[PDB]
Amino acid sequence: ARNVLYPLYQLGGPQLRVFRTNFFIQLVRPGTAQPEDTVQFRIPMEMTRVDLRNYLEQIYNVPVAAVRTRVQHGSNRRRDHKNVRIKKPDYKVAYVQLAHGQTFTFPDLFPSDLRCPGIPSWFGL
Amino acid sequence: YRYGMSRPGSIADKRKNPPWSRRRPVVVEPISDEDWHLFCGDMVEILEGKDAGKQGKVVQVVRQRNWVVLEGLNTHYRYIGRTKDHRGTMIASEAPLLHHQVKLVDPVDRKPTEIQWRFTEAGERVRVSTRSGRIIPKPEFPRADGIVPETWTDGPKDTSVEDALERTYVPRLKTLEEDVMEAMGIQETRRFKKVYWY
Amino acid sequence: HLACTAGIFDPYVPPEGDARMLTQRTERLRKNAASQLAIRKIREFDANFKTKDFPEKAKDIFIEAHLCLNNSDHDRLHTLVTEHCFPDMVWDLKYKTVRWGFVESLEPAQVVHVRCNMYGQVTVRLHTRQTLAIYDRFGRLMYGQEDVPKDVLEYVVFERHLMNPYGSWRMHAKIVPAWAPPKQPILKTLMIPGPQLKPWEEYE
Amino acid sequence: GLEEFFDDPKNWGEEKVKSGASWTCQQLRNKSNEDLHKLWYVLLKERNMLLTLEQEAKRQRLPMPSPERLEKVVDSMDNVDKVVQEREDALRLLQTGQEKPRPGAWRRDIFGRIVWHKFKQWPIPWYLNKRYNRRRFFAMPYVDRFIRLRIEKHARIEARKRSLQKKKEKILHAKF
Amino acid sequence: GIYTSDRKFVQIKEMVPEFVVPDLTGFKLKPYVNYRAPAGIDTPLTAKALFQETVAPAIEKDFKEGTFDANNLEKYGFEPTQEGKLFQLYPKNFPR
Amino acid sequence: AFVRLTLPPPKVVDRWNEKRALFGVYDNIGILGNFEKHPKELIKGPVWLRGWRGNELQRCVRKKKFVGNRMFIEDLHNLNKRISYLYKHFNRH
Amino acid sequence: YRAPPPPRRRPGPHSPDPENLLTPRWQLTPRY
RNA sequence: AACUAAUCCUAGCCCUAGCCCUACAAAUAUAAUUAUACUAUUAUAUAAAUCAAAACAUUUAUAAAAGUAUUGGAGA
């Protein structure tokens, strides 16, 4: 869940459960060379690496061994016609290593007449 | 933004209406939804234009410019496939017709009779001729996308017809979250401490 | 929107010696089995379409279309011919002046074969003497003679959209018989370039 | 599963993938609360897979097959949320009568404007929270000049739009 | 989690959201719907409709029988307080 | 300078329209109405100059008094400053 | 065209409304 | 018939009239826009001067009666 308030927890409170998840993630081909088990993911900035582990393990039943995440700064050099800087949306790249000996490789998605020139050929005259 | 024959947002439209355009505004007389009487598929007679006096069926209506498009009428000639290798082939290209340039046709008598909007027993609004009052029923036109709802066959990720129409909701004094707990039987005895909202 | 279709539904095969040649008219009667059912389809929408009288109406359109070229009457020519015919006629005549005239027809025009949601296509046989002279932008003569008649035999196909209430007979294409003589040569001279080769490559 | 993040292998390389219309609000209302919760995940799973494919398409600089599929899913998800929210909203009014899920009230800011203030959760009461008391909900005396400007500005706005309308009217007279 | 004194992170299990994933087996609803299926006119649910569907039948039966009193409003489904429920309608105590 | 290469759009004026044709009617209200209503009473315009005329300073001063209670603070202050400059020029030079 | 009706001043007694803020004080005096 | 250039009409405004007004989520005064404790929380005296009196000093405006009676380095 993103862009929402989570209930404040105090001693003796229930466990926090998100019945419906607003986090949306996309699998991306690794730009750098990574181990085959390692997988790159683009996730919302408010999601934690633990949430991704729970997200994959619960929603997709994918076993995860290790996770490494980075935040990419979006370029703001670009400017519009009005001279207002345009900022690329910042995104987080998550390197997820599979567990149970599983291996991953990015799927291969998207597998007139020449003798008489200048006179229209229509003329027979 | 001046609306044109090209669909808004197209590459040609961007050239036609750049953000920095400051040309003299074009005047289009505002027409109310009740006032407007021209719809796609309606047989109308061109009051004025290149093909004035020829009855045709509407195929596109740009209400922003009060333009009615008749296929094969008010039609000019242009080259299709004009390229370096080939000279090109003439084609017939339609030009926009303003709303006042066409009038609806009475089916019984083929004439450009002025019409007035009025409801029917079924409740559907129908245009009625001011003179020789008659009911001009709404014409039947195929869906623009070409998809016939009945002919459509479910593909992958598409529910069957019966499944979608099934009603399972049972009115009760419980929210979705509570209902999900009841079905799944989640049990939690902890309770949040008081929170001072302010 | 298209009011004509490129190509010919059924290509009529001209027989050698037809120029020398009642007679051929009976051959259509013999071949009415192939064409009369097509003739009925044109007749159904029109009912006045007859192979005997059609050529006169078609001939006027053919002659008129050529006349528009002399006056560059593009607007008029569009009505006379179908959209397929127009690009061929006028594109190569840009920035050129042509004097075209029609000498008396050698033989009467006769319908030859017809084969049409419905575009009736009628093949017509025409032999006529004409005069042609084309000049450059500067007025220099580049093709044809101003006042010399050339006898030309060709088969002309007209096409009308039967379904449309506004459909009319407009010239669509010309069928050229193989036995027809070659066209006159151009006054100017052309050069066929030699093979183009890179510095590494050598002439062969 | 990882396969769920990607489209059907058969569909890969196809110009489009056949898909139907999005779920309408009325149909979702007929569905039960438990059914609505399940459908949200089903739509979400399809949405994520389409997002994954679209991102790869952008990287490959290739067109996305049947982009309307994502739009249909998003519309269905939005329809689901409101239908569920409608049931939540109706019950909240019945049991409590509060027109908003979050406690709030109308308060005056330091600029003299009246704005709805959404209450925040705190572990201590307001009087024991100095920082909350530090927050200013009162207007300074100098705002009186601003209040007059706001009334004048509102009057000025009416004049400007009328002037703008007059210029548009010139087009009507000029064109006709 | 919570950052306590000495700059030490201590994760709190309760504050960590847990994704409750429903079982999609046996569920007949899919992301898209047939073009063959007619669309339903939108009828947003309101408190009047919710009360009529759920609460009205009980009171109507009770009113005819005469077994109705003000003290037993909770009997027909009124909640005196939202405390004790995991999901509280107001103030909202659960995430989307 | 360079001048237009096209003529301005033609203008057609109706000299017998209701406004022009009936302009001035009832201007003799006083003599033809027994002088019950003075022709100055037929003046339409700003309130402070209906039936009255004066120089700009008098007009501005009369405007301030007539709608001073309805004048904007910004406008009233600006008018006072302008009047101050006008007063010195007329009454001292 | 026909000229509009001549302007006429309303005759007869007219009583100003005392409660109205706009009405001047002197118009509400006994002298009035 | 030439390059540089030039050509255009509304973008809009101005003055009166009329009219008082009562037009998403998330985050925020802490370090504003930082989802929860810290640290209590708070504007403003005649308006003056410039200016006029050719400097400068008291002084210097901000319906008719009438610019009259009066006031004033009796001077602006």
Show residues of chain E in contact with B182, CB under 8 Å: none
Report residues 51-70 of F contacting strand H, contact meaning Cβ closer than 7 Å: 63, 65, 70
Pair B177, E87: CB distance under 8 Å? yes
**Angle subtended at Cα A68 by Cα A64 and Cα A71, rounded to the nearest 5 degrees:** 135
* Secondary structure class of B126 (helix, strand, coil): strand
Tokens matching residue D18: 């056949």
What is each CA distance from A56 to A44, D43, E12, E86, in whole angstroms? 14, 17, 21, 26
Closest CA to D137 of D107, D167, D172, D101: D107
Is residue F73's beta carbon less than 7 angstroms from any atom in nucleic acid strand H? no
In angstroms, rounded to a whole number, what is the distance separating the alpha carbons of residues C83 and B171? 66
C60: enclosing H helix or E strand: helix C54-71
Length of chain B: 198
Pair C14, B107: CB distance under 8 Å? no
Residue type, D72: K
In angstroms, rounded to a whole number, what is the distance separating the alpha carbons of residues C181 and B159? 69
Our separate counts of H helices and E strands in chain F read 4, 0
Q: E–D contact (≥3 CB pairs within 8 Å)?
A: yes
CA of A73, closest CA in chain E: separation in Å?
Answer: 26
Phi, psi at residue F78, to the nearest 5°?
-65, -40
Tokens matching residue B12: 């040609």
C107: enclosing H helix or E strand: strand C97-114
- Closest residue in chain C to residue A112, using alpha carbons only: C92
Residue type, E11: Q
- Would you list the DSSP string of G16-29? PPSS-SSS-GGGGS
Pairing of strands D104-108, D114-118: antiparallel
Pairing of strands B126-129, B135-136: antiparallel
C 82-121: CB under 8 A from A? 85, 88-93, 96, 100
| E runs forming strands in F1-93 | none
Pairing of strands B126-129, B115-118: antiparallel
> How far is C-alpha E54 from the chain's CA centre?
14
Tokens matching residue D167: 């210029």
Pair C154, C175: CB distance under 8 Å? yes
Query: Which residues lie across from B115 on neighbouring strands?
Result: B129
In angstroms, rounded to a whole number, what is the distance separating the alpha carbons of residues B165 and D28? 10
> How far is C-alpha B117 from the chain's CA centre?
19
Pair B23, B2: CB distance under 8 Å? yes
* Secondary structure class of D64 (helix, strand, coil): coil
Alpha helices in A21-81 (DSSP H): 49-59
In angstroms, rounded to a whole number, what is the distance separating the alpha carbons of residues F60 and F87? 11
C122: enclosing H helix or E strand: strand C119-135
Closest CA to A93 of A28, A42, A47, A21: A42
In angstroms, rounded to a whole number, what is the distance separating the alpha carbons of residues C77 and C72? 9
Closest CA to F29 of F21, F18, F37: F37
Pair B38, B68: CB distance under 8 Å? yes
Closest partner residue to D171 (CB to CB) among B25, B176, B179 is B25
> Between the CA atoms of E55, E56, E57 and E62, what dihedral angle is there, to the nearest 10 degrees?
90
- Would you list the DSSP string of B80-124? ES--SS---EEEEEE--EEGGGEEEB-SSS-SB--EEEE--SS--
Pairing of strands B115-118, B102-104: unpaired
Per the listing, tokens 């389409």 go with: D50
What is each CA distance from F8 to B15, B56, F12, in whole angstroms? 30, 39, 12
Show residues of chain A in contact with E14, CB under 8 Å: 9, 13-16
What is each CA distance from A53 to A19, A56, B106, C123, in whole angstroms? 16, 5, 69, 77
* Secondary structure class of B39 (helix, strand, coil): coil
Pair D104, D118: CB distance under 8 Å? yes
Closest CA to B3 of B22, B15, B17: B17
In angstroms, rounded to a whole number, what is the distance separating the alpha carbons of residues A97 and A64? 6
Report long-range pairs for F55-61 (Cβ below 8 Å, ≥24 apart): F56/F86, F57/F83, F57/F86, F57/F87, F57/F90, F60/F86
Pair C157, C121: CB distance under 8 Å? yes
Closest CA to D74 of D95, D53, D46: D46
Closest CA to E56 of B173, C203, B29: B173
Tokens matching residue C201: 């490559």
In angstroms, rounded to a whole number, what is the distance separating the alpha carbons of residues D11 and A107? 13
For helices D33-60 and D68-95, the axis angle rounded to 10 degrees is 150
Is residue D135's beta carbon less than 7 angstroms from any atom in nucleic acid strand H? yes
Pair D31, E30: CB distance under 8 Å? no
Pair D25, D79: CB distance under 8 Å? yes
In angstroms, rounded to a whole number, what is the distance separating the alpha carbons of residues F87 and D40? 78
Tokens matching residue B160: 């069957």
Pairing of strands E18-19, A17-18: parallel
- Determine if the peptide bond prior to E91 is cis (ω within 30°): yes
Closest CA to C14 of C178, C203, C192: C178
The string over B187-196, giving b where at least 16 C-beta atoms fall within 10 Å of a residue's C-beta and e elsewhere, is eeeeebeebe
Residue type, C163: M
Residue lying closest to nucleotide H19, CA to C1': D155
Phi, psi at residue D26, to the nearest 5°?
-60, -45
Given strand C119-135, what is the order of strands in its sheet?
Answer: C97-114, C119-135, C141-161, C170-175
| E runs forming strands in D18-174 | 104-108, 114-118, 121-122
* Secondary structure class of B41 (helix, strand, coil): coil
Given strand A64-72, what is the order of strands in its sheet?
Answer: A26-28, A38-43, A91-98, A64-72
**Dihedral sign from CA coordinates of C119, C125, C130, C132:** positive
For helices F56-67 and F73-92, the axis angle rounded to 10 degrees is 150
* Secondary structure class of C97 (helix, strand, coil): strand
What is each CA distance from B36 to B59, B102, B118, B125, F66, in whole angstroms? 16, 12, 12, 12, 51
- Would you list the DSSP string of A58-73? HHS---EEEEEEEEEP
What is each CA distance from D40 to A55, B70, B174, D83, in whole angstroms? 15, 45, 18, 11
Collect all residues with Cβ–Cβ distance below 8 Å to F51 and sequence separation of at least 6: F38, F40, F41, F43
Closest CA to D33 of E50, E25, A1: E50
Our separate counts of H helices and E strands in chain D read 5, 3
Pair A75, A91: CB distance under 8 Å? no
B 111-170: CB under 8 A from E? 147, 149-150, 152, 154, 157-161, 163-166
Chain H nucleotides covered by protein, CB below 7 Å: 6-23, 25-30, 35-44, 51-53, 61-63, 76
